[PDB]
Amino acid sequence: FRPFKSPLPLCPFRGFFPFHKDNAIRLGENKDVIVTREPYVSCDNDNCWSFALAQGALLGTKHSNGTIKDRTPYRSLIRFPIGTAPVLGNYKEICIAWSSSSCFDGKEWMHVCMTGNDNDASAQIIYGGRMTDSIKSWRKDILRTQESECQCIDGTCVVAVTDGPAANSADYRVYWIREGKIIKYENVPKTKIQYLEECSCYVDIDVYCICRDNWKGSNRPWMRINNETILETGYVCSKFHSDTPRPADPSTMSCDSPSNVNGGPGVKGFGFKAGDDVWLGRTVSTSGRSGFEIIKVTEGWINSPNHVKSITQTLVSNNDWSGYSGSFIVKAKDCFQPCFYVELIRGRPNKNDDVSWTSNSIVTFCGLDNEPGSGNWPDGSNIGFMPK
Amino acid sequence: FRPFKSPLPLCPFRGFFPFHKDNAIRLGENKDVIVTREPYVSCDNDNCWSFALAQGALLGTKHSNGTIKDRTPYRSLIRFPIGTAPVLGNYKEICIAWSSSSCFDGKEWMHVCMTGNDNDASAQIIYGGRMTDSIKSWRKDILRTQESECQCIDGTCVVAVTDGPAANSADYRVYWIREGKIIKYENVPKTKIQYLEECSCYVDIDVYCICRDNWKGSNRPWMRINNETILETGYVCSKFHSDTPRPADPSTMSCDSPSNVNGGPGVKGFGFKAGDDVWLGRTVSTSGRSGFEIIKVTEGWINSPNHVKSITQTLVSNNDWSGYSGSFIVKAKDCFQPCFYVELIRGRPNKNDDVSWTSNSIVTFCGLDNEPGSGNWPDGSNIGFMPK
Amino acid sequence: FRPFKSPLPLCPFRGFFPFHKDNAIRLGENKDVIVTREPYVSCDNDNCWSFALAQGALLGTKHSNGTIKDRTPYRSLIRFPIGTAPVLGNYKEICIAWSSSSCFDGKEWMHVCMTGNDNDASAQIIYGGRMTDSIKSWRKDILRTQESECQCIDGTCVVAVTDGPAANSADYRVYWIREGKIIKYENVPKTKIQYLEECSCYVDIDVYCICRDNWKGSNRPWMRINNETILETGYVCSKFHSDTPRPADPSTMSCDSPSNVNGGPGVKGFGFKAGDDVWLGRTVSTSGRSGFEIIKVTEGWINSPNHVKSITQTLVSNNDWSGYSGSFIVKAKDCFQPCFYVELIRGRPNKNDDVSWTSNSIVTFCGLDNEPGSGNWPDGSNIGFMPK
Amino acid sequence: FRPFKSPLPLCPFRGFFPFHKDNAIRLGENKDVIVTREPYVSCDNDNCWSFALAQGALLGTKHSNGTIKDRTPYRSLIRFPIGTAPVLGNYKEICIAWSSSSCFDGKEWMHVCMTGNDNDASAQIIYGGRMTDSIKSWRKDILRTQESECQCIDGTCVVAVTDGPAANSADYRVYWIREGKIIKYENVPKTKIQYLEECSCYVDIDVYCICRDNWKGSNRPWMRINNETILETGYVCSKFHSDTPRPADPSTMSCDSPSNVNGGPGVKGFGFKAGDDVWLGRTVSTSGRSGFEIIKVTEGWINSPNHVKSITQTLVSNNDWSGYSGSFIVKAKDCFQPCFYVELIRGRPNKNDDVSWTSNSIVTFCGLDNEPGSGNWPDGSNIGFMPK
Numbered sequence A, B, C, D: 001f002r003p004f005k006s007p008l009p010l011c012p013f014r015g016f017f018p019f020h021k022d023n024a025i026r027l028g029e030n031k032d033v034i035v036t037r038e039p040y041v042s043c044d045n046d047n048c049w050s051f052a053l054a055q056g057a058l059l060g061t062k063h064s065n066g067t068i069k070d071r072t073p074y075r076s077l078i079r080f081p082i083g084t085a086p087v088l089g090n091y092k093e094i095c096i097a098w099s100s101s102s103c104f105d106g107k108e109w110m111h112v113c114m115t116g117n118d119n120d121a122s123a124q125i126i127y128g129g130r131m132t133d134s135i136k137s138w139r140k141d142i143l144r145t146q147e148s149e150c151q152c153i154d155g156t157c158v159v160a161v162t163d164g165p166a167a168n169s170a171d172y173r174v175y176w177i178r179e180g181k182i183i184k185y186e187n188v189p190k191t192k193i194q195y196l197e198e199c200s201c202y203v204d205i206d207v208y209c210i211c212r213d214n215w216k217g218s219n220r221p222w223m224r225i226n227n228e229t230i231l232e233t234g235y236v237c238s239k240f241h242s243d244t245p246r247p248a249d250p251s252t253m254s255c256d257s258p259s260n261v262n263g264g265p266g267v268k269g270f271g272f273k274a275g276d277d278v279w280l281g282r283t284v285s286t287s288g289r290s291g292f293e294i295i296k297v298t299e300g301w302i303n304s305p306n307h308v309k310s311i312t313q314t315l316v317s318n319n320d321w322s323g324y325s326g327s328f329i330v331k332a333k334d335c336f337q338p339c340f341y342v343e344l345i346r347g348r349p350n351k352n353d354d355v356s357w358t359s360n361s362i363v364t365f366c367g368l369d370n371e372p373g374s375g376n377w378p379d380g381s382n383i384g385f386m387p388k
């Protein structure tokens, strides 16, 4: 018997520390590793797990040629031990999916899995391994979800779902799901947020989601959500923006609207509110998906003339490829510890990755109330050693 | 402590949704995957599992040459995580078998495994991992069983077993087995059913089995069974037939006899009675094992002038190979959810699959009381990429 | 909490039925499988397991060349799921060993593992994964044990151990071990038995062991043992002998001494006393390790003029290689079910197995009180397909 | 519910016996095995486990070229079943690490993982799978730890940590950690010990650590520690030294200071105090990392004119490569059994290992109060068979 996960505050932290790293591309040199992208991490009562969207092919085989393609019927959400490379001998297949989210409610896993035609997709809700509910595409344009962990409070899980065009109009919703049954949904208000995709969420009493505006905002949109409703929305105030591409630091402080510059295409990313301050992950490059750093911006959560980057940890050098990044939480004593993963994409379309496939490895970090050291934890593969 | 599975009704449903897909042939390009055919799915209290008859060889090796052959001593029933490809690092060997059925009674797994010479086979009954009973061939002509899950109610498992020629006379029986001990059997009445093989069964209070007539019927025979006896028998009334080959729609309504057209060879398939209606899986082709669709036929379970195909979901295109299909159930709150798998056969004898082996992948779907979208989930292998 | 295994009688049986088969050599064609020999089977409360002496090399690699050699420091007792091929992704290493025995006492596994120099070996006793005791070679000539499961009654495990020359003098002992601690040993009386090695044991209230005389007896020596002492000894009375080599049927009835013909080298084998009758496994060939059959000899356990082979099941044809065979038991309701495995050796020194390695696969059978069918379950590998 | 491990005495023993051996290099001939070094063993309530620092590459692949390098971001502490080779299908990734220690407190695993830049490393403390605390490099010169198991008494784990130069000044500390939270640390007194690295520890009521002086001592430094503080320190009195390199036997008795001869570079090793006597592991060679033997020195723990080598077991011949060695304990009834592992390094820089990689296999031994036999258990690989 296990209770449902509760609404705990975020633990205090002052830096991020290297946790797990899978070295999946390096370890895939002899064709053992499953091709993936859009990885994330989520934990149950006992263990943290790696999740990713597999491509139904082994890295370096002929079927891996062309895996830059985002949506195929051969993509499945898979789970494998955290920090391990995904191989046929260690993975589990969760569901057929080209977009997904997963979260553990304290008793069972819930997953949200989208698959099917772009104009007629459906999301399958899996709870305790059983398919319990579904969502039908209502805008017939790539029904899609977080690509990282959802969050559950007192038995009700909250997940962000989008249907509609990129870089233009589109519907953005939150769904509330309890024991695998959809309870209700809300259309996200568009008073502030103009575009929202690929939300990265965590719990700090309430659920906070920091997402991707792929049209007009180089600043990230966000929502605060509880077990019943959407409480607040906005864009991250920080004049130091954290999407990619983005303007050079320092840029504009826009708490209530997109920056209206360098809006697309964006990249999935995350952040953590801490009092009036905010921590934001971002690529080191302002233009491309290279490097990864996390910054703390003093008073960055609020409207203030005092935004300053008080801390910058460079975790993946700008000479190394990155990709999506997302938040996850780990229960501590009476608080949730903030953690994140970084997707390290290798292959197409990265300049000079002369192989025909596209895949990734993973690195992860967790927050502690201690001072960090420094290092660099990139994918580490020599692309010239790899089967093409 | 777990109770025996009970006689629950089928859940309401109005469409089928993509669940798990293993992409086993694609993932087998580098010779990691075990050669199989006749797969199925069955679930215990905690997990659903893939089962299949392995061929005692890895795909693309020299020993895989000629695996079109149905019965050898090197075939074993194996189990592997649902939606995963079967590899040496993840499989379990259940028993030596070239025909099988498995079901979980709420406490333990039962398996029925036939092996040996065509004219002197025996079925081994395995219960909780121990060999507990057996059936000796009494007609000395390929003693054989469902190739999908059996069903257990209140501790008594029911399984269909056949001994005798194809496309001609033969004995068809149901066996009742409790904690691995055979309690009784009955010869299936031949008042209506003329041929019965490869039953696909599920629970809707009672056990319903929809099977394969490989001689005179393009319509499928069926039985309703409880923990003690056979309650009813017939052929599916639907004027839209669901075996392969079969006449073009619309055909004859034959509730009580084979259609007497396009009788053989047939293919293993399934259906679900829903009130007076029936859902039937079938190949898209009326002649060959290509494509897969499921249809709902209004009043298709009964004698009626009003049969109409109210819903048709095309799940595997007619340009893609299919194969056997079968039902399985998953316990929900107070009902059983109807699900099915489709075997996607690649290799011999499929036209233009120029390899020497025969194997399959798996895709699965479950029923929900929601409207589905649309898509296509075929095997997906480029046969020209495969080791021959 | 689990009780110690009790002294139950053997279940009634009238035939043997195919259980698990690993097809390990066939599945090893692509170099995935660990080289082994001297396999056996033993079960705990929940599962049966395969055990074997690995050679510290993968089949078909350069390190597999020369693995006909019996004793090296690179041999370990390994365990893997019953009926699966042993691969790096599924095995467990139990202990360093070039001779072993294992048994489960109802609570924990005990293993006996010999390794080291031929003239200074030691046996390590492992209990619940901990090394708890040891036996030092006292004759300095290949201290060695059963190569199949030992037996435990009411917490005391019994295992046969030999030290000394082949085809000549030597010490034969039984050891009693409780929770991994050696309690006592006895030198086996030489009033009847003249040579004893590689005992195959089972429980029928008491422990019965049927062993290998490698010097003067083509008939098999046997012992009856309880939790304190050796109760009786003899040679199997049956005038149909069951070692290899052996005289043609019918031969001499020798209840109390070796046959004094075709004495060596012998092969590990087994049998089951059933009332006054006996079941004996044997190679089909009277000269070599080819084929496998089991016979029932009426009144074969006793001195009688009425010995007749009432049943003969041929399980591996004489055209196929066999090897060691041994008994194991599986708890049923209030009796122990008799089962056995057969080692199917491929490679050196088998005529026309033109490879440089030596390894095996496994097939297993269990007894039921039903009539069997017939079949053939040999290794099944085409040696010409194998890496040499 | 499990209690914390208690302060038990060491069991009596008079010799060491072969336990588990992985044969990892032999089994890695076909590129299945993960490249490692700095292995060790540690046990929980149920099982013993192998741990090692992986190099994020498979043995014999192009990424394995150059793995002699000690510290990279691609190194992770991994865990795999004891005596098995580490492969993608069986390993778990514990944390990112180029130096580590692990121990089980009776309830959960704790790990200490150092990674990052040489001049700015941090140690992450993992407890029950969660990152709970950290240590920041305070001397900015390769913050580092035991490379073998730490020890926990009554819930408080003790681990030795070093920061600073080799063969010169440096800080050496002990940290006390409880449920993953750092409680306190102490700088090790330098009244006797002048250099301390890579401590091998065990429990004999208190924690005893025997370590490596890499500057001035061919004799090994040691500490005795309890759940609150450092109790005593010294160098092992034995006039037979046990580091590598070292003077030939017999050398100087130095209980309170380094020998001041053959001081560096040293090698990680271990020993066990037994009354006034001491057991010491050492390479057979006095100059290089070849062979392995363990000696008992009568009165070797104390200042005495009577030091004599009463027992010498040669476990790996001087013709075979060895490497690091370390202690671990296994709970027996009311005492802890002393055990050890030996790292068997193959590849660079070993003379005539003409491959581009560096890796290891493992062999292990445990102490019993019985007389041992003799044997040789080296790595066993033919380096000429290996992919380079």
Ligand SMILES: *[C@@H]1O[C@H](CO[C@@H]2O[C@@H](C)[C@@H](O)[C@@H](O)[C@@H]2O)[C@@H](O[C@@H]2O[C@H](CO)[C@@H](O)[C@H](O)[C@H]2NC(C)=O)[C@H](O)[C@H]1NC(C)=O
Binding pocket: A007, A154, A156, A205, A206, A226, A227, A228
């Ligand atoms: C939603 O959860 C509340 C409990 O959580 C509190 O209120 C939330 C809206 C949010 O602010 C959390 O951080 C708070 O901790 C549930 O409220 C309980 O309802 C039951 C039944 O009415 C009642 O017996 C309890 O007193 C309430 N508990 C508390 C602490 O107020 C509420 O039912 C949840 N709603 C849904 C739709 O599940």
Ligand SMILES: *[C@@H]1O[C@H](CO[C@@H]2O[C@@H](C)[C@@H](O)[C@@H](O)[C@@H]2O)[C@@H](O[C@@H]2O[C@H](CO)[C@@H](O)[C@H](O)[C@H]2NC(C)=O)[C@H](O)[C@H]1NC(C)=O
Binding pocket: A065, A066, A355, A356, A388
């Ligand atoms: C990656 O694949 C491309 C494309 O392969 C072709 O189209 C695929 C959909 C499939 O049908 C393949 O069988 C086809 O070959 C490869 O580019 C092709 O290379 C072949 C052989 O050299 C050549 O005949 C074609 O003209 C090429 N087609 C195109 C459009 O460029 C490419 O070589 C593959 N990359 C690697 C590293 O193998």
Ligand SMILES: *[C@@H]1O[C@H](CO[C@@H]2O[C@@H](C)[C@@H](O)[C@@H](O)[C@@H]2O)[C@@H](O[C@@H]2O[C@H](CO)[C@@H](O)[C@H](O)[C@H]2NC(C)=O)[C@H](O)[C@H]1NC(C)=O
Binding pocket: B007, B154, B156, B205, B206, B226, B227, B228
């Ligand atoms: C078969 O099962 C019944 C219980 O199931 C009911 O009857 C079946 C035939 C079928 O119609 C199900 O859908 C029904 O739910 C067992 O009947 C029980 O028998 C015991 C012992 O006699 C008696 O104490 C109970 O009252 C009965 N329970 C009910 C609900 O009637 C019957 O024993 C089973 N038969 C066998 C051979 O196992």
Ligand SMILES: *[C@@H]1O[C@H](CO[C@@H]2O[C@@H](C)[C@@H](O)[C@@H](O)[C@@H]2O)[C@@H](O[C@@H]2O[C@H](CO)[C@@H](O)[C@H](O)[C@H]2NC(C)=O)[C@H](O)[C@H]1NC(C)=O
Binding pocket: B065, B066, B355, B356, B388
């Ligand atoms: C698949 O196998 C066939 C048949 O192989 C032959 O018969 C088998 C039972 C076994 O004994 C094999 O060793 C035999 O070679 C292969 O067809 C044969 O190919 C060989 C080599 O080219 C040729 O000498 C024979 O004449 C062929 N035999 C026949 C009856 O056609 C076939 O090539 C294999 N397919 C693949 C893709 O390897």
Ligand SMILES: *[C@@H]1O[C@H](CO[C@@H]2O[C@@H](C)[C@@H](O)[C@@H](O)[C@@H]2O)[C@@H](O[C@@H]2O[C@H](CO)[C@@H](O)[C@H](O)[C@H]2NC(C)=O)[C@H](O)[C@H]1NC(C)=O
Binding pocket: C007, C154, C156, C205, C206, C226, C227, C228
């Ligand atoms: C050996 O086991 C007996 C119990 O088993 C019975 O006697 C054996 C020798 C054998 O014949 C079995 O088949 C029988 O079932 C133990 O006897 C018990 O001893 C305890 C302690 O003295 C006593 O309280 C019980 O009454 C005895 N039980 C029975 C059924 O007689 C005996 O202790 C065992 N000996 C050893 C050395 O472990």
Ligand SMILES: *[C@@H]1O[C@H](CO[C@@H]2O[C@@H](C)[C@@H](O)[C@@H](O)[C@@H]2O)[C@@H](O[C@@H]2O[C@H](CO)[C@@H](O)[C@H](O)[C@H]2NC(C)=O)[C@H](O)[C@H]1NC(C)=O
Binding pocket: C065, C066, C355, C356, C388
């Ligand atoms: C199996 O091995 C033999 C022997 O290999 C030689 O001795 C071993 C102990 C080891 O030192 C190897 O490196 C040696 O090569 C092989 O027979 C040898 O083959 C080589 C190469 O053709 C030849 O130079 C030697 O003269 C042969 N030695 C002997 C004694 O015959 C044999 O070829 C191997 N078998 C296979 C299938 O590879």
Ligand SMILES: *[C@@H]1O[C@H](CO[C@@H]2O[C@@H](C)[C@@H](O)[C@@H](O)[C@@H]2O)[C@@H](O[C@@H]2O[C@H](CO)[C@@H](O)[C@H](O)[C@H]2NC(C)=O)[C@H](O)[C@H]1NC(C)=O
Binding pocket: D007, D154, D156, D205, D206, D226, D227, D228
């Ligand atoms: C450290 O452990 C002691 C108990 O262990 C004893 O003392 C150690 C220093 C060491 O010598 C061991 O070998 C001994 O077995 C803890 O002492 C207990 O403290 C509690 C709370 O004050 C008290 O109720 C008990 O009486 C003490 N138990 C004993 C046996 O004396 C002590 O608390 C531990 N200290 C820390 C910092 O955790």
Ligand SMILES: *[C@@H]1O[C@H](CO[C@@H]2O[C@@H](C)[C@@H](O)[C@@H](O)[C@@H]2O)[C@@H](O[C@@H]2O[C@H](CO)[C@@H](O)[C@H](O)[C@H]2NC(C)=O)[C@H](O)[C@H]1NC(C)=O
Binding pocket: D065, D066, D355, D356, D388
């Ligand atoms: C092991 O690696 C060395 C070095 O490889 C070179 O440097 C690496 C960092 C990486 O950049 C590689 O791609 C480089 O090739 C190999 O030595 C090189 O061999 C190549 C090919 O023969 C040659 O062109 C270079 O001159 C060599 N470089 C040096 C410094 O020697 C070496 O061959 C590898 N060993 C094995 C067994 O493959």
Ligand SMILES: [Ca+2]
Binding pocket: A212, A213, A214, A215, A216, A217, A218, A219, A243, A244, A245, A262, A263, A264, A265, A266, A267
């Ligand atoms: Ca943007």
Ligand SMILES: [Ca+2]
Binding pocket: B212, B213, B214, B215, B216, B217, B218, B219, B243, B244, B245, B262, B263, B264, B265, B266, B267
């Ligand atoms: Ca038909």
Ligand SMILES: [Ca+2]
Binding pocket: C212, C213, C214, C215, C216, C217, C218, C219, C243, C244, C245, C262, C263, C264, C265, C266, C267
């Ligand atoms: Ca003999």
Ligand SMILES: [Ca+2]
Binding pocket: D212, D213, D214, D215, D216, D217, D218, D219, D243, D244, D245, D262, D263, D264, D265, D266, D267
């Ligand atoms: Ca030194």
